[PDB]
Amino acid sequence: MLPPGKPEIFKCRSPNKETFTCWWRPGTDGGLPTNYSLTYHREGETLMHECPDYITGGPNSCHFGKQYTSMWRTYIMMVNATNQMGSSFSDELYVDVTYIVQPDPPLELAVEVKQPEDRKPYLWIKWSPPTLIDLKTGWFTLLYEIRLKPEKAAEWEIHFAGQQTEFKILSLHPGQKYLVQVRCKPDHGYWSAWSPATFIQIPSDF
Amino acid sequence: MLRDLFDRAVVLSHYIHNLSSEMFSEFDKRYTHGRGFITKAINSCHTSSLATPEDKEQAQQMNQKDFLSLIVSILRSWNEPLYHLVTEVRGMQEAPEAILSKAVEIEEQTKRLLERMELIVSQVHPETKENEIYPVWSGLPSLQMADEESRLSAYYNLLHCLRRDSAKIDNYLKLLKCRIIHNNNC
Ligand SMILES: [Cl-]
Ligand code: NA
Ligand code: NA
Ligand code: NA
Structure with a gap:
């Protein structure tokens, strides 16, 4: 009967300044998430985008391939955890690829x-x-x-x-x-x- | 002697970027750590209107003449704010000594780097047009406001943009060195 707890995007890393990956975790003391959705927007754009690749990075991961990755431009991102009973959003995370290499x-x-x-x-x-x-x-x-x-x-x-x-x-x-x-x-x-x-x-x- | 020029230029650009990153972090720790000052740093750099490559493929698509000219424009656009940063900080009754010392060094080395870059241009492209078109920084009143939260946020934006533009300049110069001296076989 419980909605998921508040998730947390806790790590991002770029191995080569061409792609990057971020990882999040559940916010225990909530029910079990049946879906996660990571969304983000960029500095100087209004468009909201969805994680382009939930697979490559493994469990609870968003991978940004080359066509989604650029330097010197902040990503403002958030993940929500949802089940039948409700939903919870992480804090927004501000990520610049330049500094996570x-x-x-x-x-x-x-x-x-x-x-x-x-x-x-x-x-x-x-x-x-x-x-x-x-x-x-x-x-x-x-x-x-x-x-x-x-x-x-x-x-x-x-x-x-x-x-x-x-x-x-x-x-x-x-x-x-x-x-x-x-x-x-x-x-x-x-x-x-x-x-x-x-x-x-x-x-x-x- | 291109090889010597490019090496010294890259030593300075790496050094400047590293000092700028350290200055930003001391300033952030010491004055703005507990805040949505980051949330306000968004889209507020005086150079952001310049067409600057944002990934390897855009860098590769940009030809060398325009690329060198871009770097020079960015560096020339920073003369003004670095002068005012140093002047204002130096003019405090209680100037944060580590922060001031770095600002002074980046001001002085950024001038030397721009001299190296103009030597490089005169060697590699002896007739590039002598016309400045660089973007104007005009943020001095917000650095001078008595309201401390606004003042601090203006300083935060300045140092966040400095750390970003020194990183670009350093990376673009490393790409150009490889490209020009080594035909992209560094
Ligand atoms: Cl380390
Ligand atoms: Na990656
Ligand atoms: Na995932
Ligand atoms: Na890219």
Whole structure:
């Protein structure tokens, strides 16, 4: 017999400044929603629009594909939760895509021990950007950080790699195994999750 | 030496945008955090009448000559409000020291960036017409009102627009660098 509780759009994220997704949750202490409707309008327009894609983003999600996403223009959005008994609206949320950018982790992290001849040996680390970022036209700019540690060390060593997709680390400990990860952020935005580790045995003859 | 010019221009535009974002956030925290000041920031920028690309495909459709000219117009349109921001803040009895220091730096670096951009234009397009047409900011009376809520909201709109236009300028310059120097193989 209860109408749904008040829902809340609690997260939006853009992985690449070309699309974005928002996620909402129920407002417990109400009945079970049988439908949700997310609507929004844009700054400097009057037209009200509906979520264009309720599927792609999974449960309780609105995904905005490329044809619905633009930068430097606020989205004013709201979700309602309805059942047979009534309905409830979230607060309005003000979202600008420019400020919600967090990339996926970089890909293909690979590590190699390099021993030249009389001249410091080193660890060579290489990786690729996340897929679906447009670095080539300069639409998107990515910066990177590596971290590495042997098991049981209390602190990770962090190296800022700037915009390179490779890096060289000199002073490792001979005989030690290292866990290595990489993460990236836009020029202006949030760090990605760290990539899964790649593992590297640094040989005794270092 | 285009490559050196574009690098320095991009260092400045990234730096300016970052300072503008930090200034906005200090100001918001400190003066307007608990409010529908955001709800009032909607559609009120002096540059909004300029045709500015809003996604990658519009940027790609815009040719380079017009694109460089757009960036210069935006930067030239900000001379006036940045001068008044600094002047008014600096003229307070009790000037918020972190906010003022950033405003001063963006005022001074925005001038240097516009100098770099005019050098770039003279290299890449040596005969672009010498005609200014940039939009006029004329928001000084609202920055000067005694009514604190109106005053604060006018400052909030100014810094929200600054943070937006510095972001555009920075992004458009990164696109143009890639395009002009690297044929879109950055
Ligand atoms: Cl972060
Ligand atoms: Na997305
Ligand atoms: Na959904
Ligand atoms: Na788009």
